[PDB]
Amino acid sequence: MMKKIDVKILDPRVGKEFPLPTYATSGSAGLDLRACLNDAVELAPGDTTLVPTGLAIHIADPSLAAMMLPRSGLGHKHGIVLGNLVGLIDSDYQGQLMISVWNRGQDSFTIQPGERIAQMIFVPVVQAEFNLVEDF
Amino acid sequence: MMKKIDVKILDPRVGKEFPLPTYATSGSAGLDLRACLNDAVELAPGDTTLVPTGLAIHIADPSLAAMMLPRSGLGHKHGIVLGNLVGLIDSDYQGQLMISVWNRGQDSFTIQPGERIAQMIFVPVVQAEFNLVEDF
Amino acid sequence: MMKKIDVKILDPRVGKEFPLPTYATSGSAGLDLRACLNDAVELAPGDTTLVPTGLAIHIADPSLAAMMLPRSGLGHKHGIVLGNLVGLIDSDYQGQLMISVWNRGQDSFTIQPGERIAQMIFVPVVQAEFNLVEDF
Numbered sequence: 184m185m186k187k188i189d190v191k192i193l194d195p196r197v198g199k200e201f202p203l204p205t206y207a208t209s210g211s212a213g214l215d216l217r218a219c220l221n222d223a224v225e226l227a228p229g230d231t232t233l234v235p236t237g238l239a240i241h242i243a244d245p246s247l248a249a250m251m252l253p254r255s256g257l258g259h260k261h262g263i264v265l266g267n268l269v270g271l272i273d274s275d276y277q278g279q280l281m282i283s284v285w286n287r288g289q290d291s292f293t294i295q296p297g298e299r300i301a302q303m304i305f306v307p308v309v310q311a312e313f314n315l316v317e318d319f
Numbered sequence: 320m321m322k323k324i325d326v327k328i329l330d331p332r333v334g335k336e337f338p339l340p341t342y343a344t345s346g347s348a349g350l351d352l353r354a355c356l357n358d359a360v361e362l363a364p365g366d367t368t369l370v371p372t373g374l375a376i377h378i379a380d381p382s383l384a385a386m387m388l389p390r391s392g393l394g395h396k397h398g399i400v401l402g403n404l405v406g407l408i409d410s411d412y413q414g415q416l417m418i419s420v421w422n423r424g425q426d427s428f429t430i431q432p433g434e435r436i437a438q439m440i441f442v443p444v445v446q447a448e449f450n451l452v453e454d455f
Numbered sequence: 456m457m458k459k460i461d462v463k464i465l466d467p468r469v470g471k472e473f474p475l476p477t478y479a480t481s482g483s484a485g486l487d488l489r490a491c492l493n494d495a496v497e498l499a500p501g502d503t504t505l506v507p508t509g510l511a512i513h514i515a516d517p518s519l520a521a522m523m524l525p526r527s528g529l530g531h532k533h534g535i536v537l538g539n540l541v542g543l544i545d546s547d548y549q550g551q552l553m554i555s556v557w558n559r560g561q562d563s564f565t566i567q568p569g570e571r572i573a574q575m576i577f578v579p580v581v582q583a584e585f586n587l588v589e590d591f
């Protein structure tokens with residue numbers, strides 16, 4: 184299920200120091216996002232840091248959203264997850280994609296420039312039109 | 320992608336002390352949910368509390384579900400997230416929407432009556448019909 | 456919205472020591488997943504453990520994915536959630552479903568063999584085809 188999504192590159196290292204996000208396979212659900220950093224960031228246990236990506240998207244279609252999730256291995260094996268748990272990207276958001284990275288475990292972890300640190304999925308969304316009732 | 324969803328108001332302060340949830344824009348994916356509280360609740364680091372909303376929905380359509388997520392800023396900046404991480408609302412649920420609020424950070428936070436504390440998205444869902452195989 | 460999904464049973468206790476996952480009702484969004492364990496696992500506060508299910512799926516349809524979520528009560532009441540927060544299962548994954556269980560709270564918890572420890576939802580997904588722009 185393909186959908187064209189506009190992407191703007193904000194930092195000149197993207198596509199060159201490290202690549203633009205790509206699906207691993209035609210059956211992949213997520214896209215890995217990489218840390219756009221001038222220097223590595225050490226995260227102590229319990230620490231949160233805001234990691235730029237150097238990228239912006241504009242989904243535009245109000246029937247689509249993106250969700251940012253932890254990478255599976257980072258989360259399970261290293262306790263490196265998202266500070267907001269799941270990061271919802273609305274169809275009208277056009278700012279830089281920023282990743283809230285939280286060390287939920289007990290071991291310090293250093294995020295290297297270019298390292299894949301999160302993933303993003305695109306899912307259909309619906310807007311509720313509420314119908315007020317006083318009994319179901 | 321609009322869908323009519325029945326909503327029932329359980330507490331008389333809703334729509335008056337604070338408003339019914341509304342989408343910020345026609346491109347918003349989520350709806351913010353507000354804390355329906357008689358008094359402010361201080362959450363110490365590591366603390367979880369169950370926050371009422373004063374609202375119930377009945378999605379009814381078995382091809383739709385809701386997901387409750389942290390607010391982005393609360394999560395990243397203040398460590399105020401969900402104790403169940405992501406809260407799934409089934410199409411047949413008709414009870415009050417309750418928010419499990421967890422302080423995952425290091426700073427105490429007080430939830431004020433009426434404060435937006437979570438968000439909710441509506442997503443299509445599929446029920447699996449399993450086909451048992453002994454090799455893929 | 457039903458979709459046939461191939462399932463393979465990897466451990467002979469499945470469907471016999473404990474059952475194959477089933478939807479509670481025709482309106483349920485999620486499927487509970489059970490711990491396939493030879494002995495109970497005590498999780499101290501802050502601990503993560505990798506729990507087998509004894510099952511594999513092969514979604515196959517690149518327009519569908521699965522998301523593994525905490526159970527609501529386990530998360531809110533007991534602080535038993537997922538170490539990767541949300542676990543994304545791609546359409547091409549055909550390995551065993553493994554659950555990263557993390558004790559995010561302050562009380563030790565023992566996972567019993569057969570206990571329901573997570574839930575899984577099936578959601579449509581889209582693959583982005585990026586359109587590079589230099590201004591939105």
Ligand code: EMC
Nearest residue numbers: 194219220221235
């Ligand atoms: C770090 C600004 Hg890429």
Ligand code: EMC
Nearest residue numbers: 330355356357371
């Ligand atoms: C707090 C019952 Hg609104």
Ligand code: EMC
Nearest residue numbers: 466491492493507
């Ligand atoms: C625990 C191998 Hg079921």
